[PDB]
């Protein structure tokens, strides 16, 4: 028998454009990120790796504009918007930039640049 081997994160694209002069990939369409009890969506995603030894993946995405969505067991889902949104995988963390809105279960926040949790 043969088939799949591993799916640690699920990812889909409508249109990919690969850099045949170098290495970078442009993503376009409705790119999804699945990670635990959060998701992200964009048109634009870019993939970069600024350090080989420590396997240092990083991505970002925007234009949709990029949003968070979270589904919560206690019946309190949460979301937010930004002009820019980055996922520094090699730093365990996420940042919003430009007109960053987040709603928490308690209140909302709206500003320049806002930190987010996994």
């Amino acid at each position: 028998v043969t088939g799949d081997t591993d799916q640690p994160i699920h990812i889909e694209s409508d249109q990919q454009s690969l850099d045949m002069q170098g290495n970078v990939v442009t993503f376009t369409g409705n790119v999804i990120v699945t990670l635990g009890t959060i998701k992200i969506n964009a048109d634009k995603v870019v993939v970069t790796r600024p350090g080989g030894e420590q396997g240092k993946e990083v991505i970002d995405g925007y234009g949709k504009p990029a949003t968070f969505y979270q589904m919560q067991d206690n019946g309190k889902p949460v979301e937010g918007h930004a002009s820019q949104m980055h996922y520094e995988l090699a730093k365990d963390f996420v940042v919003l930039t430009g007109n960053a809105y987040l709603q928490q279960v308690d209140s909302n926040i709206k500003g320049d640049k806002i930190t987010y949790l996994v």
């Binding site: 591993d6 799916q7 640690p8 990812i11 694209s13 409508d14 249109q15 990939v25």
Partner: peptide, 16 residues
Amino acid sequence: VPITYVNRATXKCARY
């Protein structure tokens, strides 16, 4: 393993 993804064009999926 490398990055892998499905496509709304190809239907079949691929590695990067």
